[PDB]
RNA sequence: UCAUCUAGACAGCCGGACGGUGGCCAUGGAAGUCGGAAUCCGCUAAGGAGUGUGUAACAACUCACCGGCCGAAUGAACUAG
């Protein structure tokens, strides 16, 4: 109905610095830096007082003011990802054949290999996106932890590792085997 | 209809403020209706207990601000879950009864307003 | 037997879904309309059939 | 030490409860019958207090039971299992007496209120010669003193 | 309660994914060795319909054989037997309504 | 994992042939190891070996025996692997294994027990009382092929 | 077209969600929740003679109602470009 002014806010903590030329956002924090191209979404940014930034759209439709809250959530996710970090814990689920997961190196690229998923001879290799660190966690049986700054990279790597272990030609409500993400949170959760 | 019920609440509160000099602000957390009912019965003779939406109460006090100006002091204390006890008895006897009754695994008196004076107690 | 908590975690992704009656799509359990274009975003949905 | 409460039609499962307390079913039934000798014709709550040797039976006051008793009733075998719809006279004094008998047990809000609640309890009973039960309770202030 | 103990025993043997004939042989051997829980059971087991059968004393030496579903509680099986009783009564009333016009 | 409780066996309170308090049944139907004991096993891989031994096919059983023997050979890793529970389970399975119709299964089994004793000597005393009758029965056997190596190994 | 709304609405968290009373028939039982009718009071800020899960019947959990945080519009049914 052409909402003539809608506007969201993002809060900037003390440690980070955000640089926005045209629609390219750079967020710099203690854990590092992240960048984002937003030239497809057509909003406007405005710094208020060096810890608050308003984002606004003028004369926008329903889809456009939906995209405004979307881009606010994206830049806020970037800020909280460079402050606290992002950590996804996944668990191994098997009935009979134990899933054997290691880290190998074809041409120095940090592959995650998955062996013996439902006893097959095929070896499933998923690549690792840059900026994502993977630790096979102790003291909890069969648990893998992916950590990083970018929620997109961490959650996409976790999703690729989940989708690589799909069961074919069986009832998947009975054959529940796989690697499933059980926890999503921050590296410095409850800071 | 909704407004009418609301109007009655405003009126009763005003009457209660006038009727009893001593006011006790009580905060209730995890107190069952049964727990509350028992307390009310024990104090029926000497005390009046009022529960209401805070937004509703604040407006009422502001509305009744010109009369009874000292009651304005109570407004900062109103924030958070609160209940109002209006009693003839001056202070400790009422307080002792409220805290003791129905402690289970818990009523607390956050503040006391008597005669235009506020006591943390 | 897997484990009770681990069966719950696997069934969260495999069994606790909904199925569109028109195009058989596997849908979120609290969904109201199908996300697919070919059925016309219909609201004819059923729970995914469990065992036992 | 242990109290068990059961609703029992008088004159008489019980055994299952009794086994936990190691008490003979027949003995309990006889004791209950004596207690309900007063509230036998109709169901009444019975409280059994166990001393670890024997159980003592008392009939706890209940509004429905007291109201049903107040309505005069020809004794019913119940073999018929008829509807046995209950029709009653106003019995204003009896209800007030019942309210007093409750004595604000379990904290009825007011003496008048206890009577009003007692009137409501007569969902089953007609409770008046010519009126809905408790229809006129709001209208008439009479008998408020009597309940107290 | 003892029926519930027998059910918990048979269900514990079932949950080990044990073969049904080996379970019946285990029941026979424990009956020979004098286990009470085994001796309450009757050997032609209907595990295909998840049903066992159990011997109960008629007087608190004659014993009756009652079929118990493993997927319902003992009280729930008793309510099913009560339900089959109640359905039989209604058919009898329908017969009593039939009798006069039928015999005429 | 392994599930269920052997209530009937537990009420029986029979160790059968076994003197270590573990039920032993030469007969195929009874004397099977408890699910809890199997859950208690140190390694998931070990559990698989036991499951395989449980499985009916002789070849599968034979394969399982072989895997176990190789593991025993690597004592350094396997001392940690070996468990009292494993030993108890082993005794229960071993009883059925000695009765095996196949010569190879029996022979491998006898050899395995002997290997276990040598690696764990002086730490198997509780188990020894149970192990010795079974081992002895195998060593003196009508069939020369099963008996002679077993006897030589026993002396060794 | 109905409703709610700065005297605090709809989502999301958190707390209470009670007595008369196991209301009256009927059942081997059914206490809000197998059914048949009625469906009323008290305390209330508020709580149905019950919305479901729920047990042999209980117990237990959740609801629709009221409250703290939020501060401003939202819910249902229908019509046609
Ligand atoms: Zn569809």
From Swiss-Prot, chain A:
Q: Which GO terms describe its molecular function?
A: rRNA binding; structural constituent of ribosome
By its UniProt entry, which Pfam families does this protein fall under? Ribosomal_L6
Q: Which cysteines are joined by disulfide bonds?
A: none
Kindly give the SUPFAM superfamilies that the UniProt entry links to this protein.
Answer: Ribosomal protein L6
For whether the record's keyword set contains Phosphoprotein, the answer is: no
Q: Some GO term, biological process aspect, for this entry: which one?
A: cytoplasmic translation
Do you know which PROSITE patterns this protein is assigned to? Answer: RIBOSOMAL_L6_2 (PS00700)
Instruction: Give the keywords, sorted.
Output: Cytoplasm, Ribonucleoprotein, Ribosomal protein
Query: Which terms in the GO cellular component ontology are assigned?
Result: cytosol; cytosolic large ribosomal subunit
Q: Where does this polypeptide localize?
A: Cytoplasm
Q: Which InterPro entries match?
A: Ribosomal_uL6-like (IPR000702), Ribosomal_uL6-like_a/b-dom_sf (IPR036789), Ribosomal_uL6_a/b-dom (IPR020040), Ribosomal_uL6_CS2 (IPR002359)
Family according to the record: Belongs to the universal ribosomal protein uL6 family.
Other remarks on this protein: Present with 52400 molecules/cell in log phase SD medium. There are 2 genes for uL6 in yeast.
Which function does this protein serve?
A: Component of the ribosome, a large ribonucleoprotein complex responsible for the synthesis of proteins in the cell. The small ribosomal subunit (SSU) binds messenger RNAs (mRNAs) and translates the encoded message by selecting cognate aminoacyl-transfer RNA (tRNA) molecules. The large subunit (LSU) contains the ribosomal catalytic site termed the peptidyl transferase center (PTC), which catalyzes the formation of peptide bonds, thereby polymerizing the amino acids delivered by tRNAs into a polypeptide chain.
UniProt name for this protein: Large ribosomal subunit protein uL6A
Curated annotation (Swiss-Prot), chain B:
What is its subcellular localisation? Cytoplasm
Where exactly is the Glycyl lysine isopeptide (Lys-Gly) (interchain with G-Cter in ubiquitin) cross-link placed along the chain? 12, 95
Tell me where in this chain the PTM Phosphoserine is found: 66
**Subunit (UniProt):** Component of the large ribosomal subunit (LSU). Mature yeast ribosomes consist of a small (40S) and a large (60S) subunit. The 40S small subunit contains 1 molecule of ribosomal RNA (18S rRNA) and 33 different proteins (encoded by 57 genes). The large 60S subunit contains 3 rRNA molecules (25S, 5.8S and 5S rRNA) and 46 different proteins (encoded by 81 genes). The 5 acidic ribosomal P-proteins form the stalk structure of the 60S subunit. They are organized as a pentameric complex in which uL10/P0 interacts with 2 heterodimers, P1A-P2B and P1B-P2A. uL10 directly interacts with 28S rRNA.
State the function annotated in the UniProt record: Component of the ribosome, a large ribonucleoprotein complex responsible for the synthesis of proteins in the cell. The small ribosomal subunit (SSU) binds messenger RNAs (mRNAs) and translates the encoded message by selecting cognate aminoacyl-transfer RNA (tRNA) molecules. The large subunit (LSU) contains the ribosomal catalytic site termed the peptidyl transferase center (PTC), which catalyzes the formation of peptide bonds, thereby polymerizing the amino acids delivered by tRNAs into a polypeptide chain.
Hey, which family's this protein in?
Belongs to the universal ribosomal protein uL10 family.
- Name the chain's protein: Large ribosomal subunit protein uL10
Q: From the entire protein, which fragment is shown?
A: 3 to 199 of 312
Swiss-Prot record, chain C:
Q: How does it assemble?
A: Component of the large ribosomal subunit (LSU). Mature yeast ribosomes consist of a small (40S) and a large (60S) subunit. The 40S small subunit contains 1 molecule of ribosomal RNA (18S rRNA) and 33 different proteins (encoded by 57 genes). The large 60S subunit contains 3 rRNA molecules (25S, 5.8S and 5S rRNA) and 46 different proteins (encoded by 81 genes).
Instruction: Report the subcellular localization.
Output: Cytoplasm
Q: Which residues of the full protein are shown?
A: 77 to 128 of 128
Q: What is this protein called?
A: Large ribosomal subunit protein eL40A
Q: What does this protein do?
A: Component of the ribosome, a large ribonucleoprotein complex responsible for the synthesis of proteins in the cell. The small ribosomal subunit (SSU) binds messenger RNAs (mRNAs) and translates the encoded message by selecting cognate aminoacyl-transfer RNA (tRNA) molecules. The large subunit (LSU) contains the ribosomal catalytic site termed the peptidyl transferase center (PTC), which catalyzes the formation of peptide bonds, thereby polymerizing the amino acids delivered by tRNAs into a polypeptide chain.
Cross-link entry Glycyl lysine isopeptide (Lys-Gly) (interchain with G-Cter in ubiquitin), positions: 17
Swiss-Prot record, chain D:
An annotated Gene Ontology molecular function? structural constituent of ribosome
Q: Would the keyword Ribonucleoprotein be found if you checked this record's keyword annotation? A: yes
Domain of life of the organism in this record? Answer: Eukaryota
Query: Is the Phosphoprotein keyword given for this protein?
Result: yes
Please describe the post-translational modifications of this protein. Although not reproduced with a second method, methylation at Lys-2 cannot be ruled out.
Instruction: Name the PROSITE patterns for this protein.
Output: RIBOSOMAL_L11
CDD domains, A to Z: Ribosomal_L11
Q: Where is the protein localized?
A: Cytoplasm
GO annotation, biological process: cytoplasmic translation; ribosomal large subunit assembly; translation
Q: Which residues carry this modification: Phosphoserine?
A: 23
For this protein, the record's HAMAP family field holds: Ribosomal_uL11
How is the quaternary structure described?
Answer: Component of the large ribosomal subunit (LSU). Mature yeast ribosomes consist of a small (40S) and a large (60S) subunit. The 40S small subunit contains 1 molecule of ribosomal RNA (18S rRNA) and 33 different proteins (encoded by 57 genes). The large 60S subunit contains 3 rRNA molecules (25S, 5.8S and 5S rRNA) and 46 different proteins (encoded by 81 genes).
What this protein is reported to do is described as: Component of the ribosome, a large ribonucleoprotein complex responsible for the synthesis of proteins in the cell. The small ribosomal subunit (SSU) binds messenger RNAs (mRNAs) and translates the encoded message by selecting cognate aminoacyl-transfer RNA (tRNA) molecules. The large subunit (LSU) contains the ribosomal catalytic site termed the peptidyl transferase center (PTC), which catalyzes the formation of peptide bonds, thereby polymerizing the amino acids delivered by tRNAs into a polypeptide chain.
Q: Would you tell me the protein name for this molecule?
A: Large ribosomal subunit protein uL11A
Upper taxonomic lineage: Eukaryota, Fungi, Dikarya, Ascomycota, Saccharomycotina
């Amino acid at each position: 109905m052409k909402y003539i002014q809608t506007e969201q806010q993002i809060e900037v903590p003390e440690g980070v610095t955000v640089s926005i030329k045209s629609r390219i956002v750079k967020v710099v924090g203690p854990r590092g830096t992240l960048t984002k191209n937003l030239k497809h979404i057509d909003v406007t940014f405005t710094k208020v007082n060096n810890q608050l930034i308003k984002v606004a759209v003028h004369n926008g439709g329903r889809k456009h003011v939906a995209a405004l809250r979307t881009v606010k959530s994206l830049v806020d996710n970037m800020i909280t990802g460079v402050t606290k970090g992002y950590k996804y814990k996944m668990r191994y689920v098997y009935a009979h054949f134990p899933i054997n997961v290691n880290i190998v190196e074809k041409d120095g690229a940090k592959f995650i290999e998955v062996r013996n998923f439902l006893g097959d001879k095929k070896i499933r290799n998923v690549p690792v996106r840059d900026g994502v660190t993977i630790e096979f966690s102790t003291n909890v049986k069969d648990e893998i932890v992916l950590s990083g700054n970018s929620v997109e990279d961490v959650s996409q790597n976790a999703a690729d590792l989940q989708q690589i272990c799909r069961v074919r030609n069986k009832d998947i409500r009975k054959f529940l085997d796989g690697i499933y993400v059980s926890h999503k949170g921050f590296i410095t959760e409850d800071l | 209809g909704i407004r009418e019920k609301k109007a009655e609440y405003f009126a009763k509160l005003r009457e209660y403020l006038e009727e009893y000099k001593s006011l006790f602000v009580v905060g209730v957390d995890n107190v069952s209706s049964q727990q509350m009912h028992e307390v009310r019965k024990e104090l029926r003779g000497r005390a009046v207990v009022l529960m209401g939406k805070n937004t509703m109460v604040r407006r009422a006090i502001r509305g009744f601000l010109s009369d009874l100006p000292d009651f304005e002091k109570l407004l900062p204390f109103v924030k958070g879950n609160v209940g109002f006890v209006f009693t003839n008895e001056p202070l400790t006897e009422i307080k002792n009864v409220i805290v003791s009754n129905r402690v289970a695994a818990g009523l607390t008196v956050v503040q006391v307003y008597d005669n235009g004076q506020v006591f943390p107690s | 037997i897997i484990e009770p908590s681990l069966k719950a975690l696997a069934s969260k992704y495999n069994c606790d879904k909904s199925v569109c009656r028109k195009c058989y799509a596997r849908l979120p359990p609290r969904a109201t309309n199908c996300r697919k274009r070919k059925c016309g975003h219909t609201n004819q949905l059923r729970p995914k059939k469990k065992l036992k | 030490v242990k109290y068990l409460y059961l609703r029992a039609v008088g004159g008489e499962l019980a055994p299952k409860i009794g086994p936990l307390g190691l008490s003979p079913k027949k003995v309990g039934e006889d004791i209950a019958k004596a207690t309900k000798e007063f509230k036998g014709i109709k169901v009444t709550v019975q409280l059994k207090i166990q001393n670890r040797q024997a159980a003592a039976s008392v009939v706890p006051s209940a509004s429905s039971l007291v109201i049903t008793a107040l309505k005069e009733p020809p004794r019913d075998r119940k073999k018929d299992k008829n509807v046995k719809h209950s029709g009653n006279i106003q019995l204003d004094e009896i209800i007030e007496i019942a309210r007093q008998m409750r004595d604000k047990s379990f904290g009825r809000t007011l003496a008048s209120v206890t009577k009003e609640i007692l009137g409501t309890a007569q969902s089953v009973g007609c409770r008046v010669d010519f009126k809905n039960p408790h229809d006129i309770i709001e209208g008439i202030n009479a008998g408020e003193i009597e309940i107290p | 309660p003892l029926i519930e103990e027998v059910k918990l025993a048979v269900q514990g043997l079932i949950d080990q994914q044990m073969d049904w004939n080996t379970i019946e042989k285990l029941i026979k051997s424990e009956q020979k060795k004098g286990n009470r829980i085994a001796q309450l059971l009757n050997l032609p087991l209907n595990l295909k319909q998840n049903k066992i059968s159990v011997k109960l004393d008629l007087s608190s030496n004659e014993k009756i054989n009652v079929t118990i579903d493993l997927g319902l509680s003992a009280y729930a099986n008793a309510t099913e037997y009560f339900n089959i009783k109640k359905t039989s009564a209604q058919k009898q009333k329908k017969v009593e309504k039939n009798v006069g016009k039928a015999m005429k | 994992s392994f599930g269920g409780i052997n209530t009937f066996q537990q009420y029986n309170t029979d160790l059968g042939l076994g003197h270590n308090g573990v039920r032993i049944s030469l007969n195929y139907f009874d004397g099977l190891p408890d699910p809890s004991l199997l859950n208690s096993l140190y390694s998931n891989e070990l559990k698989l070996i036991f499951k395989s031994l449980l499985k009916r096919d002789e070849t599968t059983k034979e394969k399982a025996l072989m895997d176990l023997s190789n593991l025993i050979s690597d004592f350094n890793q396997n001392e940690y692997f070996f468990n009292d529970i494993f030993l108890l389970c082993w005794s229960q399975i071993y009883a059925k294994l000695i009765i095996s119709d196949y010569k190879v299964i029996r022979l491998q089994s006898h050899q395995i027990t002997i290997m276990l004793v040598k690696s764990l000597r002086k730490k198997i005393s509780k188990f020894l009382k149970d192990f010795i009758p079974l081992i002895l029965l195998g060593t003196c056997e009508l069939d020369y092929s099963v008996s002679k190596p077993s006897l030589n190994e026993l002396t060794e």
